[PDB]
Design a protein around this motif. Structure first.
Motif, short mmCIF file in Angstrom:
data_model
loop_
_atom_site.label_atom_id
_atom_site.label_comp_id
_atom_site.label_asym_id
_atom_site.label_seq_id
_atom_site.Cartn_x
_atom_site.Cartn_y
_atom_site.Cartn_z
N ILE A 197 11.29 7.62 4.07
CA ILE A 197 12.37 7.08 3.26
C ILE A 197 11.89 6.06 2.24
N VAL A 198 10.82 5.33 2.54
CA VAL A 198 10.28 4.32 1.64
C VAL A 198 8.84 4.68 1.30
N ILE A 199 8.47 4.48 0.03
CA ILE A 199 7.14 4.87 -0.44
C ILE A 199 6.06 4.10 0.31
N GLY A 200 6.38 2.91 0.82
CA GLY A 200 5.40 2.15 1.57
C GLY A 200 4.96 2.82 2.86
N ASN A 201 5.76 3.77 3.35
CA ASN A 201 5.43 4.44 4.60
C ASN A 201 4.11 5.21 4.53
N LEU A 202 3.68 5.59 3.33
CA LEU A 202 2.45 6.35 3.19
C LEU A 202 1.28 5.56 3.79
N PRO A 203 0.44 6.19 4.60
CA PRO A 203 -0.74 5.49 5.13
C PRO A 203 -1.65 5.04 3.99
N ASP A 204 -2.21 3.84 4.15
CA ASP A 204 -2.98 3.24 3.06
C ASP A 204 -4.23 4.04 2.71
N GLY A 205 -4.68 4.94 3.60
CA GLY A 205 -5.74 5.86 3.24
C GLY A 205 -5.39 6.76 2.08
N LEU A 206 -4.10 7.04 1.88
CA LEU A 206 -3.63 7.79 0.72
C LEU A 206 -2.97 6.90 -0.33
N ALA A 207 -2.83 5.60 -0.06
CA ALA A 207 -2.23 4.65 -0.98
C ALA A 207 -2.69 3.24 -0.62
N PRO A 208 -3.86 2.82 -1.08
CA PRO A 208 -4.41 1.53 -0.63
C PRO A 208 -3.56 0.35 -1.06
N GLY A 209 -3.72 -0.74 -0.32
CA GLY A 209 -2.97 -1.96 -0.54
C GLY A 209 -3.05 -2.51 -1.95
N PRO A 210 -4.27 -2.66 -2.49
CA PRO A 210 -4.39 -3.14 -3.87
C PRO A 210 -3.67 -2.28 -4.89
#
Lengths: 49, 49
Positions: free
Chosen positions: A17-30
Motif C-alpha cells: 500500500i505504501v511505496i516505502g514497503n519495498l525492501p531497501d535492496g530494491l530501493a535504498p535509503g539514500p
C-alpha cells in the motif's frame, strides 16, 4: 509470503500500500531522501525554511 | 467568479502558493503586471527589457 495455519502451510499475498514497503535492496535509503529532495525542488522549497 | 472578465486570473494564485517569502517575489508579482499592448511592447523593448 508462506505461512503456517493449524499445522498446514499456505501461501499469503498482500498489497504494498505504501511505496516505502519495498525492501531497501530494491530501493535504498539514500534514494528515498533524494527523491524527497526532488519533491522539494518541485515545490520550490529547495532550501527548507 | 467572472475569471474571463477579471483583471487578474488563476496563474497569479497558482504562483502565489509556491512563493518563497523574500522581497524578490514581490517584484516578480510587480513584474507580471506589465501590459500586453503595442505602446507597452515598444516602450518595454526600447529599454531592451
Amino acid at each position: 509470503t508462506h505461512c503456517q495455519e493449524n499445522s498446514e502451510t499456505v501461501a499469503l499475498c498482500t498489497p504494498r500500500i505504501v511505496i516505502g514497503n519495498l525492501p531497501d535492496g530494491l530501493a535504498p535509503g539514500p534514494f528515498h531522501e533524494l527523491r524527497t529532495w526532488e519533491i522539494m525542488e518541485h515545490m520550490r522549497l529547495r532550501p527548507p525554511p | 467568479a467572472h475569471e474571463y472578465h477579471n483583471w487578474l486570473r488563476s496563474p497569479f494564485s497558482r504562483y502565489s502558493a509556491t512563493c518563497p517569502n523574500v522581497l524578490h517575489s514581490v517584484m516578480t508579482l510587480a513584474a507580471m503586471l506589465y501590459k500586453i499592448s503595442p505602446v507597452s511592447l515598444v516602450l518595454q523593448t526600447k529599454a531592451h527589457i
